[PDB]
Amino acid sequence: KEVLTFEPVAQDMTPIIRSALKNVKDKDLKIVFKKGTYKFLPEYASSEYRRITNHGNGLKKIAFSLDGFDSVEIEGAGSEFVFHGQIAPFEFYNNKSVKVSNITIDWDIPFTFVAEVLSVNEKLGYRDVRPVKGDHQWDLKGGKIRFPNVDGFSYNYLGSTLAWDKNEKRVVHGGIDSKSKSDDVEDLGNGVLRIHERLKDYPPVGSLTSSKGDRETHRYAPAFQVKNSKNIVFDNVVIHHALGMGFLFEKSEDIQILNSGVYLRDGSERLISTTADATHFANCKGDILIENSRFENMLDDGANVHGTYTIVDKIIDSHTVMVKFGHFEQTGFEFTGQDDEIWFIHQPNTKRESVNTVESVNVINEAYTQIKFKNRLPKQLAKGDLLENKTWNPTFTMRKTIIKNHRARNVVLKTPLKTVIEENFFSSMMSSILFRGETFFWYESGAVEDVLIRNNTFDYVAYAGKPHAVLNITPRLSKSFNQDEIYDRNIRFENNTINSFGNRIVWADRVGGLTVSGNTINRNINQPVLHPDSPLFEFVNSENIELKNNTYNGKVQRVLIVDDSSKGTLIDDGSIK
Amino acid sequence: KEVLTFEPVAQDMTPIIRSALKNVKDKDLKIVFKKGTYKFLPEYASSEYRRITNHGNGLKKIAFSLDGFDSVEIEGAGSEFVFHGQIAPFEFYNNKSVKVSNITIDWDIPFTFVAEVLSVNEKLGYRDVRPVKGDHQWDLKGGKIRFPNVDGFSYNYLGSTLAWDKNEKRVVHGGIDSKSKSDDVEDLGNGVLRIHERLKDYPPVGSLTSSKGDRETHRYAPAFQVKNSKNIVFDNVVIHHALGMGFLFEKSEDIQILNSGVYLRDGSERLISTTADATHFANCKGDILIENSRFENMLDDGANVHGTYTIVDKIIDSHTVMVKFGHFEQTGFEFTGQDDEIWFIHQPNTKRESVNTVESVNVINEAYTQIKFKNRLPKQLAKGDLLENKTWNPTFTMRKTIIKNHRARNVVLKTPLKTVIEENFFSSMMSSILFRGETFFWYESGAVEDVLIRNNTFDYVAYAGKPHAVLNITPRLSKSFNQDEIYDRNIRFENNTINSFGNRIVWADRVGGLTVSGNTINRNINQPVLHPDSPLFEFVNSENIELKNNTYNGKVQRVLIVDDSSKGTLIDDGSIK
Numbered sequence A, B: 001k002e003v004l005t006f007e008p009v010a011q012d013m014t015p016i017i018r019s020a021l022k023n024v025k026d027k028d029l030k031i032v033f034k035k036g037t038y039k040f041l042p043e044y045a046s047s048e049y050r051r052i053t054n055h056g057n058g059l060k061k062i063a064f065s066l067d068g069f070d071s072v073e074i075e076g077a078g079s080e081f082v083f084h085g086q087i088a089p090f091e092f093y094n095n096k097s098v099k100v101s102n103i104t105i106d107w108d109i110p111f112t113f114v115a116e117v118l119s120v121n122e123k124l125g126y127r128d129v130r131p132v133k134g135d136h137q138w139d140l141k142g143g144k145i146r147f148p149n150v151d152g153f154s155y156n157y158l159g160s161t162l163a164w165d166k167n168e169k170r171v172v173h174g175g176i177d178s179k180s181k182s183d184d185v186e187d188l189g190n191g192v193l194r195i196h197e198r199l200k201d202y203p204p205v206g207s208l209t210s211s212k213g214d215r216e217t218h219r220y221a222p223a224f225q226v227k228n229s230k231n232i233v234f235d236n237v238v239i240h241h242a243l244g245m246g247f248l249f250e251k252s253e254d255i256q257i258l259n260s261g262v263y264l265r266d267g268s269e270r271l272i273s274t275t276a277d278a279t280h281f282a283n284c285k286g287d288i289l290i291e292n293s294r295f296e297n298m299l300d301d302g303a304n305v306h307g308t309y310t311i312v313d314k315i316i317d318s319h320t321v322m323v324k325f326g327h328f329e330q331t332g333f334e335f336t337g338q339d340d341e342i343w344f345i346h347q348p349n350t351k352r353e354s355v356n357t358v359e360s361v362n363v364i365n366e367a368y369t370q371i372k373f374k375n376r377l378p379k380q381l382a383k384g385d386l387l388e389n390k391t392w393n394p395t396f397t398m399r400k401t402i403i404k405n406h407r408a409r410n411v412v413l414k415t416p417l418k419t420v421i422e423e424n425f426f427s428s429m430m431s432s433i434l435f436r437g438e439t440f441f442w443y444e445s446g447a448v449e450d451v452l453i454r455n456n457t458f459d460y461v462a463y464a465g466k467p468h469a470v471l472n473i474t475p476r477l478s479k480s481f482n483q484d485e486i487y488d489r490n491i492r493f494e495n496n497t498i499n500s501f502g503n504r505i506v507w508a509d510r511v512g513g514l515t516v517s518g519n520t521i522n523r524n525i526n527q528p529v530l531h532p533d534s535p536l537f538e539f540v541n542s543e544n545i546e547l548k549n550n551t552y553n554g555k556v557q558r559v560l561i562v563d564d565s566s567k568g569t570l571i572d573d574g575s576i577k
């Protein structure tokens, strides 16, 4: 067992870490840092071609690459790690045990453009904005904005842009994503820019807008990528920025994120923490626990636990099928391997039909995978059918955790195994708890079968411009499949408190077995309804729904919309009427 | 020794080759095709991250990847291989012997946009063009041209654009490169498009323009990439298209290109053959022979034999130095290795100062290489000095070859070893025989020391809109170095015939030992002089130049310009007065 110790010796710690990690030989490593501030530049970092699910693949500069250990552990002792430019801070591949603790991650210059809206001229199609300085960086050239200008890198456009409350640093009431692609930007002097372009949705005067650049390059790497690993514990790890997601796990098992978080630095002038998901779990297995953590100000969801749907491309022989990934940021994924159990899904029926066990895999390229199964394939397997990995699904628990003031859904749940969401505090621009099995664009699997959402506080939820709900069960399945079959099952939503401004509470589509019980809804938020006459509850194409012992306080609101087939099995004790 | 034989079995030969080549196990392989037309798609091709000098690195789809053979041979028996989309047709890595023969290479849809210029409006900034159809592909979407729209790929803009003579399929007289970046293209009906943008140089009406797309993605891969191989023979191999160079060799030894070529298919509607260099030799050694070949209609040089200049970044210790690549398409190059001899060049002096021998190499990333030498480094080695690889330089012979009707220089010569250019037919838009050691942008090495250019025919040379010459000796060295030191040496230009229209014959800068003798210049080409009062010969900052027994026939032309220091050692027998 090797033990490496480090101190803040050089202005760029990357070469020192790079050299030490290269000479490691033992399969058990522990790295200790003396409490201090360490800066890492990518210039002299190791570079490898990497495959990163739900990010862009490519050549990456990597600061910490820990591959193949029996156990590897990083003790930050409260240090702060400052990164620079396009770099992947941490990669843990192929480790039988991983622990990182007591560390703060941040960048020296964020990959964002943040500006206060001074005025909007919709008639002439421009807006005037004052860019936030702090440690943001940008300039003008060619009549357009360039940012962040780090190591010679600049985005082409501001890209997808969102309006935030300047004081609360949360998304504005009614906020809608707006794509900025302006070729015409003037310096008006005194630090004011005039951005010429017509927008479908302009930002409100006085708000701060965020921009994270071009869709095709701004998912560079998460702060942590864990691949093919086991027994992973993050403890007192705080992320202030990343060029992608915060904690990303692929094909890994038994994960704990404890007393950790993704949020803004107290007193800073930052608006965005991670530019994508705070936490993300792609085809993991074993157990996942998020406890005592805090996720704020990301530009995407707080958590997404899900697997991959691959698409049957052709049948090779009686035991061998070739599948394809469906979304461009899934290519390069390690879908399966020897001894995995796999579900077959046959058009046009959305359900898991049968199970088989993988004998071997021939990865053809990053898009196509040839899988040979131990048992004969189903006779009805056809091109366009789906494979879902059955082995690589986790149990999932989130408790005593805060998720608020960010862009997107708080919690996105797609595992078929036991899921517990309890004793959390939630506040979400979009839906708070969202279910979306997806075979249309994202190809993310996860018809659920056992989910308990209880004793949480939902405060200020679903204030986006587009319609959302506190609990939103909404699969989006390819038109090659029937659109009215039961998908998710056995969801319980018990004893939560919802502070509301008139938003939807539950929207359920194709759920079989949904209990909404013991909840208190407090219409006590002074903000305007953005979708008039939205019911508290709406159910379409579902079965065995029960409303029980809920309470509504405040100005009246439409309670129920239910279609005829769901009404047939709706138990409703009239708790709210 | 394995022998694989194939026949035109399926619409897509890629899977059959992929599977067969994956199961080869002997170190001696021969692949035989029955004479026919074979088509290869990238969809199911193997994908690997590849490093390709003077191209862009990244994930490549690869049809033939032959790695590590004692001997590998491909016998095409006159077959035609048709490729499709973004694919690398052939890769030969780490092979002790390579032979390819009797094969024609082409694409089903070229990655070019070609159009006849119908009208130009310089006041309003537009041009009307009719796209050539043939097997070109393109459309309009978002108000601009998309091409080639193959497997979902399209360039952003037309990119680097050049005008050609419709009937000769060569660059127009006075042709100049023009960047096309037009956001506004409309269909005027009748197969005519209007391209809105202001150009510094407009194409002439009646000319065909070629466009090859965005600078940053159009160097995808050469038709052939040969890396770390030796004893390589191409014989009767013809290339009609590639997404890059035709024959590219890196760190390879003893190469012959015999009875081969890069040119347009007779009777086709193509204008461009390869979108980059026909042949290219990056830090090869041993001998290179090009004989009885034919290179036409490329969008870059016919041949460039050259090495790499790396830049000293850091002195690590008494024996170890870290260098950096200078041009962005050189990163990932394999600069050196154990037992290589290396030249050191110390600012501000351009000359090779001392030699050392490499003990080991520690590749840090694609930009930075750490080199440990067997002997102590020079005391005066400093950041910004250069290393040149001394071992990896070849002898070079081109004979009985035709190079004409393409964009750029015919032959670019940067090896220090014996070079012979004889009995060829050259016609060139730019300079025909060009010398450019380059430590400013391209970082390409070789001050030459022994070059013989004799018994060639130069017919219609240097008709570009910018000034060039039949023989052009023009280093381009960083301002960190003295700008008036002798660089190239011992160049002889003997017994050639030049049909001229008034162009320069010799422009020489910083040569020591130049002989121009026995040449016949016939002013017999009916084309306008574009650079008036250009002398036949011009020498600056050179030594030991001799004009001897030359003859000029036709309308009078200024003969000589020479600075005072070159005049001091110029021998001129007045044969051209």
Ligand SMILES: O=S(=O)(O)OC[C@H]1O[C@@H](O)[C@H](O)[C@@H](O)[C@H]1O
Pocket (backbone or CB within 6 Å): A048, A049, A050, A051, A052
């Ligand atoms: O993101 S991954 O592609 O899985 O990275 C792991 C791989 O990195 C690649 O760059 C290497 O060439 C492979 O040997 C392998 O180690």
Ligand SMILES: O=S(=O)(O)OC[C@H]1O[C@@H](O)[C@H](O)[C@@H](O)[C@H]1O
Pocket (backbone or CB within 6 Å): A215, A441
């Ligand atoms: O990550 S994004 O760039 O916003 O993805 C864009 C996509 O969003 C999806 O919800 C739509 O179904 C797609 O048709 C596409 O518009």
Ligand SMILES: O=S(=O)(O)OC[C@H]1O[C@@H](O)[C@H](O)[C@@H](O)[C@H]1O
Pocket (backbone or CB within 6 Å): B048, B049, B050, B051, B052
């Ligand atoms: O262009 S090169 O980088 O030299 O290619 C050779 C390499 O390809 C990479 O994709 C592999 O991970 C390496 O194992 C090696 O095979």
Ligand SMILES: O=S(=O)(O)OC[C@H]1O[C@@H](O)[C@H](O)[C@@H](O)[C@H]1O
Pocket (backbone or CB within 6 Å): B215, B441
């Ligand atoms: O082939 S290209 O890469 O588009 O050429 C662009 C380059 O041309 C060179 O001659 C210039 O000196 C460089 O400064 C650079 O602009």
Ligand SMILES: O=S(=O)(O)OC[C@H]1O[C@H](O)[C@H](O)[C@@H](O)[C@H]1O
Pocket (backbone or CB within 6 Å): A054, A276, A277, A300, A301, A304, A412, A436, A437, A438, A442, A444
């Ligand atoms: O189908 S979903 O509506 O849940 O969207 C899936 C999508 O959610 C987030 O945008 C992530 O950043 C993406 O990588 C992807 O997981």
Ligand SMILES: O=S(=O)(O)OC[C@H]1O[C@H](O)[C@H](O)[C@@H](O)[C@H]1O
Pocket (backbone or CB within 6 Å): B054, B276, B277, B300, B301, B304, B412, B436, B437, B438, B442, B444
């Ligand atoms: O310094 S030079 O003027 O000879 O230019 C070097 C340059 O020449 C061609 O453009 C090649 O395609 C490039 O890869 C590069 O070799």
Ligand SMILES: [Ca+2]
Pocket (backbone or CB within 6 Å): A051, A052, A053, A054, A055, A056, A057, A328, A329, A330, A331, A332
């Ligand atoms: Ca990816």
Ligand SMILES: [Ca+2]
Pocket (backbone or CB within 6 Å): B051, B052, B053, B054, B055, B056, B057, B328, B329, B330, B331, B332
């Ligand atoms: Ca390259």
Ligand SMILES: [Cl-]
Pocket (backbone or CB within 6 Å): A018, A019, A022, B362
């Ligand atoms: Cl190292």
Ligand SMILES: [Cl-]
Pocket (backbone or CB within 6 Å): A149, A150, A151
């Ligand atoms: Cl900077």
Ligand SMILES: [Cl-]
Pocket (backbone or CB within 6 Å): A110, A112, A114, A269, A270, A271, A272
């Ligand atoms: Cl920010």
Ligand SMILES: [Cl-]
Pocket (backbone or CB within 6 Å): A331, A365, A366, A367, A368, B047
């Ligand atoms: Cl692929």
Ligand SMILES: [Cl-]
Pocket (backbone or CB within 6 Å): A540, A541, A563, A564, A565, A566
């Ligand atoms: Cl219904």
Ligand SMILES: [Cl-]
Pocket (backbone or CB within 6 Å): A362, B018, B019, B022
């Ligand atoms: Cl295969």
Ligand SMILES: [Cl-]
Pocket (backbone or CB within 6 Å): B149, B150, B151, B152
């Ligand atoms: Cl196509």
Ligand SMILES: [Cl-]
Pocket (backbone or CB within 6 Å): B110, B112, B114, B269, B270, B271, B272
């Ligand atoms: Cl063409």
